[PDB]
Amino acid sequence: QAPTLGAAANFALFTTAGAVTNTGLSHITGDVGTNNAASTNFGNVDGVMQDSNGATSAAAADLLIAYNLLNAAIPTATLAPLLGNGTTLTAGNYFIGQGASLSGTLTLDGGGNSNSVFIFKIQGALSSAANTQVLLTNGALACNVFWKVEGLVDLATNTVMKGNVVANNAAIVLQSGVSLEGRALSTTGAITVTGVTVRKPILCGSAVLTGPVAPNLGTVVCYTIFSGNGALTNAGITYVTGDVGTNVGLTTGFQADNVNGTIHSNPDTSTAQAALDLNNAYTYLNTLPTDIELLYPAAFGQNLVLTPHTYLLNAATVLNGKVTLDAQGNENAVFVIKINGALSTTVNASVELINGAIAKNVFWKVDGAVDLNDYTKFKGSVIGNNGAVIINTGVEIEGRVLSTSGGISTFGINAQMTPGCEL
């Protein structure tokens, strides 16, 4: 059996004792923390910032247990300290009785068995040369790779690294552009990262993320652009699949032959029922418990990747460029993004879906105005509350844009509802 990390598994970056510091734009999936200080200068992290609390205390204890199992592992072979340079290794417990250095390419080959475990016992420091790459093949999984390092871990610029890097009574330093599918864990010592990507490995018994239970949209699943209260006005050449309308005021500017659906030119029984159902959905989304707070709403996007959870952005939010929603292979995964303020975007902003994520299962609860800037590619169901909506030239929506209250103005857009309507 590979060693369990217990609570330490929750983390991308963790030290039992010391400072945890970021510089520049880093992309992190997993908790970040220290059991005796507070991490500084991180941007948006897909994980909880855990500082000197019950979570870090638990991680500290389980990291110790993990370390001891690593230290107890009976070596299957000895390696020279120069690791990589085109070398391939199969499963084993590898003993290096001095400081080690990674260089060039190192391939870990699973032999067609995803249960293959690779443990490196480094009796000294571990360094890499710039542009070093650790590669996995033939079934090998990052969650089954471990480095037990008795000294400073220092990974050079653009190092591609795999596995759980456990530094015992030493610091970890991850230089510009390091990309780690794995974890940086210290039993005490500082962690310093600069412009890195670190994503905790999935599998090896990690719970499959589902996200929260999706709201029931009721009849508003059949609408694509809808206001509970306020004029709905389109200009330019716009195409819609699904219904459009307002429950208070007039809908104008949509050309019937461009709408695969019904334009409700003024309020009717359908808009009345949609308005009730929109309020119910908003209230449901608003009251879902927050899993992860994204601490920098002004900096949202910039190639942030999210996983199935309920997120809170606790201020007006700007989507700059791209945000990606990663279902991690679970097509039924739900993402809820609660925004406590207005939502606006840059031109060419985008929401992208990977690893099975579908727009039907993405929801945005926006407590304020919604403004989708020119040529934004937006996905999911946006439910705004008390604020005007503007959807600018060329915006593409796979999903819907709804407001409980507020006028809506659209300009030359293409908006197509996601599945659920049965009319």
Residue numbers in the entry: 23 to 445
Reproduce, without paraphrasing, sentences from the article in which this PDB structure was first reported.
Antifreeze proteins (AFPs) are a class of IBPs that have been documented in a number of cold-tolerant fish, insect, bacterial, fungal, and plant species, and this phenotype permits them to prevent and/or control ice crystal formation. Previously we examined the expression, ice binding affinity, and effect on cell viability during freeze-thaw cycling of a bacterial protein. This 54 kDa AFP (IBPv) was secreted by a bacterium within the family Flavobacteriaceae (strain 3519–10) that was isolated from a depth of ~3.5 km in the Vostok Ice Core. Based on the recombinant IBPv exhibiting TH of 2.2°C at a concentration of 53μM, it is categorized as a hyperactive AFP. According to primary sequence, IBPv was predicted to consist of two separate ice binding domains.
Each domain contains a six-loop right-handed β-helix (solenoid) with a triangular cross section, and an α-helix, which runs parallel on one side of the β-helix. However, no electron density was observed for the last 88 amino acids of the C-terminus. In the IBPv structure, one flat plane was observed on the same surface for each domain as shown in Fig 1B and Fig 2, and they were not at the protein-protein contacts in the crystal. Each domain of IBPv has two rows of water molecules on the IBS that form hydrogen bonds with the protein backbone, and more water molecules are found in the IBS of domain B compared to domain A. In the crystal structure of IBPv, a layer of ordered water molecules forms a water network that consists of several pentagonal and hexagonal ring on the IBS of domain B. However, no such water network is observed on the IBS of domain A, which is the weaker one in ice binding activity of the two domains, suggesting that the presence of water network is correlated with the ice binding activity and thus supporting the anchored clathrate water binding mechanism. Close molecular comparison of the two domains revealed that the bulky side chain of Leu 174 on the IBS of domain A may account for its inferior antifreeze activity.
